[PDB]
Amino acid sequence: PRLAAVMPDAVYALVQGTHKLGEYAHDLVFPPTPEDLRKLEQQVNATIPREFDRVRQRYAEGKIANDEQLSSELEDASFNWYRRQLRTSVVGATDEELEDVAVRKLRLEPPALQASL
């Protein structure tokens, strides 16, 4: 049944299954820290866009949903973030004109080295 689709699924199954087996066997010989499981949670917490915070707290206080009212809630924040990204890519960010986009995509300005030391 359309092997041209089965082969990527086969390699994907292999990769993901090997990763899961590895993490399993790795947190057995080394049990995970009972507190830095919160630290990795904080690390992934620091990476979420802002368009989702208006939903996030709403999930803590019950208000949010049953199970699907949520799944259609995340789509709105998602598409808001998506259209913001389209705008930033094409016409620029929130605080930069067209010249700043030109110097961004021409790589005229080095990463600031003097400041970081």
We find the least distance from the C-beta atom of residue 1 to another protein, in angstroms, to be: 7
Q: Which is nearer to another protein, 2 or 107 (CB)?
A: 2
Q: Which is nearer to another protein, 98 or 117 (CB)?
A: 98
Chain residues in the site for another protein (CB under 8 A): 1-4
We find the least distance from the C-beta atom of residue 92 to another protein, in angstroms, to be: 14
What residues contact 91, with CB distance under 8 A and at least 6 apart?
A: 98, 101
Supply φ then ψ for residue 72, to 5 degrees: -95, -10
Q: What is the largest distance, in Å, between two alpha-carbon atoms of the chain?
A: 59
Alpha carbons 92 and 102: distance in angstroms, whole number? 10
Q: Which is nearer to another protein, 27 or 100 (CB)?
A: 100
We find the least distance from the C-beta atom of residue 10 to another protein, in angstroms, to be: 13
Q: Which is nearer to another protein, 6 or 86 (CB)?
A: 6
**Contact (CB, 8 A) for 55 and 77:** yes
We find the least distance from the C-beta atom of residue 33 to another protein, in angstroms, to be: 45
Taking CA 84 as the corner, what is the angle to CA 54 and CA 44, rounded to the nearest 5 degrees?
55
